[PDB]
Amino acid sequence: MKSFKVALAQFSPHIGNIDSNTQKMIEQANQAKKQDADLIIFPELSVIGYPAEDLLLRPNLNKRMQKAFAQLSEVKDIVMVFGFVNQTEDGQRYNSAAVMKDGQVLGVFNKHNLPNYGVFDEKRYFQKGHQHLVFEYLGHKFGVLICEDIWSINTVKQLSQLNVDTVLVLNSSPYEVGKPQHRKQTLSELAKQLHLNIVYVNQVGGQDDLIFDGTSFVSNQNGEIALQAPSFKEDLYIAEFDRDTKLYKVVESAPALETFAEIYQGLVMATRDYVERSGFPGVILGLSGGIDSALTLAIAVDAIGAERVQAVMMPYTYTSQISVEDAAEQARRMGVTFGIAEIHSIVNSFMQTLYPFFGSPADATEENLQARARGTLLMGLSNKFGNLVLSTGNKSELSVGYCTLYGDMVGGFAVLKDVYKTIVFELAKYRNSLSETPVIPERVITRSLPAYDVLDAILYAYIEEDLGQADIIAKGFDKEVVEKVIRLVDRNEYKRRQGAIGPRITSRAFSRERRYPIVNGWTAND
Amino acid sequence: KSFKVALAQFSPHIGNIDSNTQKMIEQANQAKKQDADLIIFPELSVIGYPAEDLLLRPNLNKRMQKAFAQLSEVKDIVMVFGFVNQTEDGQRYNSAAVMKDGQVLGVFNKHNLPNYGVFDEKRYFQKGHQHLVFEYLGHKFGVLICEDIWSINTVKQLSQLNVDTVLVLNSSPYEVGKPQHRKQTLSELAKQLHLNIVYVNQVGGQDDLIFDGTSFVSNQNGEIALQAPSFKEDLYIAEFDRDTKLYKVVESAPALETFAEIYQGLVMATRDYVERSGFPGVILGLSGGIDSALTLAIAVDAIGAERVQAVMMPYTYTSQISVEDAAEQARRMGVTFGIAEIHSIVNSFMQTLYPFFGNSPADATEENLQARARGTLLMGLSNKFGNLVLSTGNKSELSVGYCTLYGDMVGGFAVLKDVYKTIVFELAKYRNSLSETPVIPERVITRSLPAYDVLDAILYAYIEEDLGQADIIAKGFDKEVVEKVIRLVDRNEYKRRQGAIGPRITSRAFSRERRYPIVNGWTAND
Ligand SMILES: Nc1ncnc2c1ncn2[C@@H]1O[C@H](COP(=O)(O)OP(=O)(O)O)[C@@H](O)[C@H]1O
Ligand SMILES: Nc1ncnc2c1ncn2[C@@H]1O[C@H](COP(=O)(O)OP(=O)(O)O)[C@@H](O)[C@H]1O
Numbered sequence A: 001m002k003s004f005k006v007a008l009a010q011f012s013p014h015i016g017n018i019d020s021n022t023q024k025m026i027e028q029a030n031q032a033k034k035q036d037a038d039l040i041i042f043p044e045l046s047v048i049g050y051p052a053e054d055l056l057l058r059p060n061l062n063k064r065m066q067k068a069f070a071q072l073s074e075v076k077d078i079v080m081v082f083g084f085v086n087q088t089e090d091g092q093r094y095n096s097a098a099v100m101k102d103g104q105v106l107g108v109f110n111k112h113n114l115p116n117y118g119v120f121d122e123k124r125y126f127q128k129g130h131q132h133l134v135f136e137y138l139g140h141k142f143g144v145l146i147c148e149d150i151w152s153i154n155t156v157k158q159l160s161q162l163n164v165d166t167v168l169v170l171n172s173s174p175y176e177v178g179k180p181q182h183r184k185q186t187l188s189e190l191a192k193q194l195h196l197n198i199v200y201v202n203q204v205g206g207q208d209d210l211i212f213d214g215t216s217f218v219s220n221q222n223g224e225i226a227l228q229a230p231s232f233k234e235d236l237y238i239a240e241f242d243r244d245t246k247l248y249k250v251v252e253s254a255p256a257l258e259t260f261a262e263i264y265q266g267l268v269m270a271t272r273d274y275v276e277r278s279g280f281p282g283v284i285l286g287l288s289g290g291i292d293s294a295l296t297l298a299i300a301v302d303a304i305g306a307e308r309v310q311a312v313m314m315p316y317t318y319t320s321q322i323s324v325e326d327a328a329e330q331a332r333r334m335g336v337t338f339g340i341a342e343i344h345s346i347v348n349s350f351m352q353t354l355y356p357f358f359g360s361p362a363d364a365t366e367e368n369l370q371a372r373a374r375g376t377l378l379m380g381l382s383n384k385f386g387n388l389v390l391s392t393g394n395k396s397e398l399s400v401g402y403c404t405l406y407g408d409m410v411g412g413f414a415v416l417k418d419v420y421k422t423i424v425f426e427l428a429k430y431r432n433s434l435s436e437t438p439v440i441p442e443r444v445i446t447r448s449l450p451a452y453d454v455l456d457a458i459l460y461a462y463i464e465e466d467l468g469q470a471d472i473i474a475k476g477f478d479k480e481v482v483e484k485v486i487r488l489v490d491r492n493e494y495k496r497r498q499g500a501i502g503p504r505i506t507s508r509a510f511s512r513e514r515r516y517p518i519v520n521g522w523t524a525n526d
Numbered sequence B: 001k002s003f004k005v006a007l008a009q010f011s012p013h014i015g016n017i018d019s020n021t022q023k024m025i026e027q028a029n030q031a032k033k034q035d036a037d038l039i040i041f042p043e044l045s046v047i048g049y050p051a052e053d054l055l056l057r058p059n060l061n062k063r064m065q066k067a068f069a070q071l072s073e074v075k076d077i078v079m080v081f082g083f084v085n086q087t088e089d090g091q092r093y094n095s096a097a098v099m100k101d102g103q104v105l106g107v108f109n110k111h112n113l114p115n116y117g118v119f120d121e122k123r124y125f126q127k128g129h130q131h132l133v134f135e136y137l138g139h140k141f142g143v144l145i146c147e148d149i150w151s152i153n154t155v156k157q158l159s160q161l162n163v164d165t166v167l168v169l170n171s172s173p174y175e176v177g178k179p180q181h182r183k184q185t186l187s188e189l190a191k192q193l194h195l196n197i198v199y200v201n202q203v204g205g206q207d208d209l210i211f212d213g214t215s216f217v218s219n220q221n222g223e224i225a226l227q228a229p230s231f232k233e234d235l236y237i238a239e240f241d242r243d244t245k246l247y248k249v250v251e252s253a254p255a256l257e258t259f260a261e262i263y264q265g266l267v268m269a270t271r272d273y274v275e276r277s278g279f280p281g282v283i284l285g286l287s288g289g290i291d292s293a294l295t296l297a298i299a300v301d302a303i304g305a306e307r308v309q310a311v312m313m314p315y316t317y318t319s320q321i322s323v324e325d326a327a328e329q330a331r332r333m334g335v336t337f338g339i340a341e342i343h344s345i346v347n348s349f350m351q352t353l354y355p356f357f358g359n360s361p362a363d364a365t366e367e368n369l370q371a372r373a374r375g376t377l378l379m380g381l382s383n384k385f386g387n388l389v390l391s392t393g394n395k396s397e398l399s400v401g402y403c404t405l406y407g408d409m410v411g412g413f414a415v416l417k418d419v420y421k422t423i424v425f426e427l428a429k430y431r432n433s434l435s436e437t438p439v440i441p442e443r444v445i446t447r448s449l450p451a452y453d454v455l456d457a458i459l460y461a462y463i464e465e466d467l468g469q470a471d472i473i474a475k476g477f478d479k480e481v482v483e484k485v486i487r488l489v490d491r492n493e494y495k496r497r498q499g500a501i502g503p504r505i506t507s508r509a510f511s512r513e514r515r516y517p518i519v520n521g522w523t524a525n526d
C-alpha cells in the first residue's frame, strides 16, 4: 500500500468531436504527469462528450473509438480512466470506462444503471452492464462506476462486497440548484457507510439546454471530504493518498456558494459557452428598462465582456422616459454599446396595412405588433453584423404564455427561460451585491446549391439513410457539393428547433425522430 | 364453430380517458349489433398514443380503474383493449386486457418496448415476460402489442403454444410505403408460422405524427382476408369459417398510389390538428409558388374552403404573374383572398435600421425583412380573428436553412415540413389529377393572474412537483386561481416549443425534461 496522487480532470468536452476530446485528454494526462499524478480520471463518455444524442448511433462510431484508443495508447507513465462507447462483437453498445496504462487496456467497465428519465435517454443508445471492474495499483484496490451507478444502493453494495479501497466515479451529472452540495452530502455519508473512498469526477460546461457544474470531489472512507473542486470551472485537481493514514489528504476549500451565486455563475457559464462554441462575435439584446433584460445584460457582460455586448432600446408611445434612462444608465455603467431605435413608424405602417382586414376593438393584437417590430429590428442587426440575439423571457412568462411568438421570444439563446420571475429578482440583487455601485439600477429591482432533384437525393442519403459523407459521394455525387450540403444541414439544427410542428411522413423526421446536438462537433471524415 | 371479430380502427383523444372509454363502449355496442363475438382496439386505446409524460401522472392508475369499471358494464362481447397496467410494486406496463361481462379474463404486458426513432417506451414502462393465450369457442387466441409482432422470437413463442389467431394491438405511426409493407411482411409471417394475424392499428393525426390505420386480417395461408383503408376511423368485421379454418376473404379497393397515400395523410393530419385544437379556420400566405399552392389545396380538402383564408403579400419584385396565379387558385377553390402590400412596412424598417447599417452593403438582411413583415402581418390577422397560421416551408428548405426565422417559418402547423421539394411537385400533380379543372394552376407546377410570488409557488407545485390541482389547492391556494394557472400552462405547450433553447437550472425544465403532448385531453380532476 504505497502513497499516490489522483488527478481529477474537471473537463469540458466538445460534444461529438472525438479528435478534439482525445487531444485534450492527452494534454490533461501530460499536465497531470507534470504534477506527479499517478492516475487521471475523466468524466463519463469523455472521448465523445455528453449529451451526444443520436451521434451515438452513427455506424462509423466504433472505428473512431478505435482510433481514439490508438492515440491514447501513446500516453506513457500514468494510469488513465476515461469514458468511451464500448461496442462488442455482437454489435451491443455500452456506456463504458477504460483503465489504460502504457497502451494496455487493464480493464473495462460497462455502466449498469442507464437513466431513462427526465433529461436522460440512455436506453435509446446503450445496453446495460452486469460485471464490476476492480484493479490493484500501487497496493490500492480501485473500483470503477459510472454516474447513475453510484446512486444505486444495490450496485454500490456489490462493489463494496469486493472490499474496494477507492471507488472511481465518472460522471456527466447535469446541474440543478442545490445539487452540487447535495452530491457531496449524500456520497460522503455513503462513503462512511461502506468504509471506502469515493473519487467523484464530473463534466463541466454549458451544452445546448444543459449546464454541467463540475464540482468534483474526493470523499474519504470516514465520511470527510478531502478535496473540493469549484463549480463551473475547468481544471485538473490533485488528491493525495496517505499510505500511513489510509486517507486522502484534506485540502482546504472556500465555502460553498450561496444559492443565487451558484445559479448566477451557472447562467454566466452557459451563456459564454453557447456564444463561444457557436462562434458568435458577440451578443445583442433589447433593453426595456425592465428587470429581465437588465439581468440578462449583466449576465452577458459577465460572460463575454462589455466590448462584445450590444444593447438596443426600442421605445414606443407608452414607453416611459424613466425606462429609457435606466436602460441607458446601466449600459453606460457597464460599458456596453447602446442605441435607441423608435418603432412608432414601423408599427403605424403595420396598422395601416392591417386596417382593411380589421375594420374590431383594439386588443392584444396591437401590442403584439410592437413586440414583433422589436424582434424583427434585432434580427436585422443580427443578420447584418452577426451578434447572437439573447431573448429575455423568464420561466413564469413561458409557463403561462405571457410572451409573444416572434416578438419578445425572438432569440437564439434564452438565458432566463428556466428562471422563475421570483428568482430573477434574487439574481439581480445578488449581482448588485458584487459591486460598490450597483450595475443594475436599484429602482429597476423595485417597480449555390444544386437543383432540388440532386439536393433531395443527397439529403435523403444523409438524413433518412444516415449515411456518412464518403458513402454519399460513392453514390456518384460531387465531393464538394456533398460536403457543403452536410455542413448546411448540421449548421441549421438550431433553426429547425424553433419551427412549428408538422406531420411525419418519412422514415426520419427532423423533430422527435432525429436527435442531434445544436453545438455539434462530429467531424465529417470516417 | 364460426365467429366474428371486430377490428376497431379507432382514433383516441390523447389523454382523454373519459372520452376514449365512452367511444370504446360505443364501438363495442356497435360491434354487437353487427354480430361480432370479439372486438379489438388499438394499443393503449384507453389513453391513446403518444400520451408521453401523462403516462407518469400519479393519478393515472385511479383513472384506469374508473375506465375498467365503466368498461365492465359492456356485456355479451369479448373486448381486447390497451391500458396502462400498474402493479402493487408500482411498476407500469404497456398492456392489453381481455374482458367479458365485467370480468378480466387475462392481461398481457408488452414484451418489446421500442426506444428508437419516434418511440420512448422505456421512459414509461417495464417489459413483460409472459404470454396471454385464451380459448374462446374452440379457437386459441394469442395477444401481442405492436413491436411484439415484429420480434420473431416473441412470435415464435406463441407459435409453440399452438395459437390459432394472434390478436395484435398497434399504435403504428405512418410513413410512406409502410401501410402496404406491413401487410406483405405479416402475411408471410402468418404463412411461416401457420397462424392467423388480426392487426388493429390506431388512426388519426396527433401532434407531429400520423397514424394511418390500415388494419387487416391475414390468414394462416398467407392471404389477406380483410383490408381496412388508410386514414379512416371505422369498425371492420372479419368472419372465421369453421370448415375452412380461415377468415373469409373480403374484397377491397386497390391500394393507394404512393402520392395519393401521402396526400390523404397530410389532409387528415391537418384536419385533426385544426379540429382538436378547436380553431375556427386557417390562414396562410399565398406566394404564387408551389409550396403555398399545395398547402392551400390541402387546407381546403381538410376543413372546407369556407374556413380557409389566403393572403398575397407582394413587395417590389413580386411578379404580376405570381399575384394572378394566387388569385386564380383562391377563386377556383372558393377561398377568401386578400392582398396586403408590404412596401411601406419594409421601408419603415429600413429607415429605422439605416443609422446602424450605415453603408454596409445590402445582403440577405434586407430580404429577410420582407419575410418577417409577412409573418407579422399573418400573425396580426391570426391574433385578431383566431385562424391557425399554416406555414408552407418544406423539408428541403428546412434541411439547409433556406427559410427565415420569424418570417416564412411563422405558423402553428407546418403541413409540408417533412415533405421534400421533390415530393411537393408530385403531390401537386396528384391533386390536380383529381378534377377536370386543376386547382393549382399548371404554370405554378412549371416555373388576471396573481402576483409573481403566488404565481411562481403554484407553477412550482404544478411543474417541478408535478402535483395535481387538488393537491396544489390543499397547499392553501384558491381553487379557481389554480385551475386557471394549470389551464394556461397546458394551453401554451405549443408556444414554448417555438422558443429558443436556454439553460436548465431547475429539477424540471420545459425543454427535454418535461414531455407533454400539444393536443392534450387530460381532464383536470382525479
Ligand atoms: N394550439 C395552438 N397551436 C398552434 N398555434 C396556436 C395555438 N393556439 C394559439 N396559436 C397561435 O398563437 C397565437 C397566440 O400567441 P401570440 O401570437 O404570441 O399572442 P398572445 O400575446 O395573445 O398570446 C394565436 O393567434 C395563434 O396564431
Ligand atoms: N448556432 C446558432 N444558434 C442560435 N442562433 C443562431 C445560430 N446561428 C445563427 N443564428 C441566428 O440565426 C440567424 C440566421 O437565420 P435567419 O434570420 O433566418 O437568416 P438567413 O435566412 O439569412 O439564414 C443569424 O443572424 C443568428 O441571429
Ligand SMILES: [Cl-]
Binding pocket: A172, A173, A174
Ligand atoms: Cl445525476
Ligand SMILES: [Cl-]
Binding pocket: B146, B147, B171, B172, B173
Ligand atoms: Cl411500428
